[PDB]
């Protein structure tokens, strides 16, 4: 059992908790209950390795956020989530990544860019724009839907692979 | 705002996680995935006081028993859960109480005894038996169903009152 410390970050309402709860429960939360901080420990097998995923589900609402540097220091990899119908949330990614790099003293931090709510027909962030940003960072981009479950295991398992391969 | 460190304990499969998830997320989970350790932070008003509930959902599977001393040290109140269709879980919850007292070095630790799965017809632990045990401890007894949501808020809120009145 190999422990991986995953942290899920991004603006309020983008789907951090919904993605995480899908991974853990195979349930879609329809309600938006702004997170303070929840943590999970989930055993999974990824490429034949028994993994203990320590997942921190963080506050994206500024009103509820505290002490981001602390959880950035301890995290091994970061799921950086935006919503494809929220341009501001995409712009906020860049700031999350900058802060993570600063806290880690490194531009090579395990990270996956997640464009969530890909079940929504009306999007404002085109896939290619996000693919381009991820390419600039040298990290994977995965499109997800917590509603349909598209990409949920892919996003988390890819992040594990990025940590393993670090 | 007052923080309350609640810890949900008891044998594997009695419904600790299902209760916690009902309280927070207002849905019932049918699949059983044994907990390692999960934590939730949730703000609520109880008896005219704004409270931050820090809820630790613990492992009942004995393979994770090494983690107990730590969470028993830090926890302020314990939701002691058994299932009304599982007599072994009732016997076990007595040992949980004894262990908590030992770790705290105190006979008066805030606790609530919870008889879960009270939606099931095939009861093997009579309410009177659990009432007798709770009376011996000097603590409340509440019957719950994570499936129907019966008693769920009552259980957690009663535990907060037990801490406040300690
Ligand atoms: N249509 C759609 N709604 C989503 C999706 N992910 C989350 N939501 C909804 O978006 C809201 C906020 O999700 P939540 O995970 O609580 O946000 P966060 O934890 O603050 O990032 C809730 O109402 C969810 O039901 C998604 O992939 N598709
Ligand atoms: N009928 C019924 N099943 C329940 C109830 N609470 C939990 N369960 C089921 O019992 C199993 C174990 O629940 P879980 O919360 O994971 O147990 P834990 O190991 O104590 O956390 C799951 O299949 C749940 O769906 C309840 O109140 N009624
Ligand atoms: F949990 Be979300 F960031 F409000
Ligand atoms: F989460 Be249970 F105790 F397996
Ligand atoms: Mg959230
Ligand atoms: Mg559990």
Residue numbers in the entry:
A (entry chain A), B (entry chain B): 1 to 166
Reproduce, without paraphrasing, sentences from the article in which this PDB structure was first reported.
After unsuccessful attempts of crystallising a BeF3– GSA complex by co-crystallising RasWT-GDP with Be2+ and F–, we adopted a new approach by soaking RasWT-GDP apo crystals with 50 mM BeCl2 and 0.8 M NH4F for 1 to 2 min followed by flash freezing. In this complex, the α2-helix (residues 66–74), which overlaps with Switch II in sequence, deviates from the one in the Ras-GDP structure by 42° but it adopts a conformation highly similar to the GTP- or GTP analogue-bound unphosphorylated Ras structures with an angle difference of <7°. This demonstrates this RasWT-GDP-BeF3–complex is mimicking a GTP-bound GSA state. Therefore, it is highly significant that in our RasWT-GDP-BeF3– GSA complex structure there is no second water molecule within 7.8 Å of PG. Only the isolated nucleophilic water is in a near-attack conformation (NAC) at PG along with the two waters closely coordinated to the octahedral catalytic Mg2+. This NAC water has an in-line angle (O3B–Be–Ow) 161° and is 3.5 Å from the beryllium atom. It donates an H-bond directly to T35 and F3 and accepts a H-bond from Q61. It encompasses broader steric and conformational effects, significant for the biological roles of this crucial PTM of Ras, especially for its interactions with effector proteins such as Raf. These two BeF3– GSA complexes both capture a “closed” conformation where Y32 in Switch I directly interacts with Q61 in Switch II by H-bonding, different from other ground state conformations as depicted by caged-GTP, GMPPNP, GMPPCP, or GTPγS. Indeed, utilising 19F NMR on BeF3– GSA complexes reveals that Switch I predominantly adopts a “closed” conformation ( ~ 90% occupancy) in solution. The 10% population of RasWT-GDP-BeF3– GSA in “open” conformation explains why we could not crystallise this complex by co-crystallisation after many attempts and why its structure has been missing in the PDB.
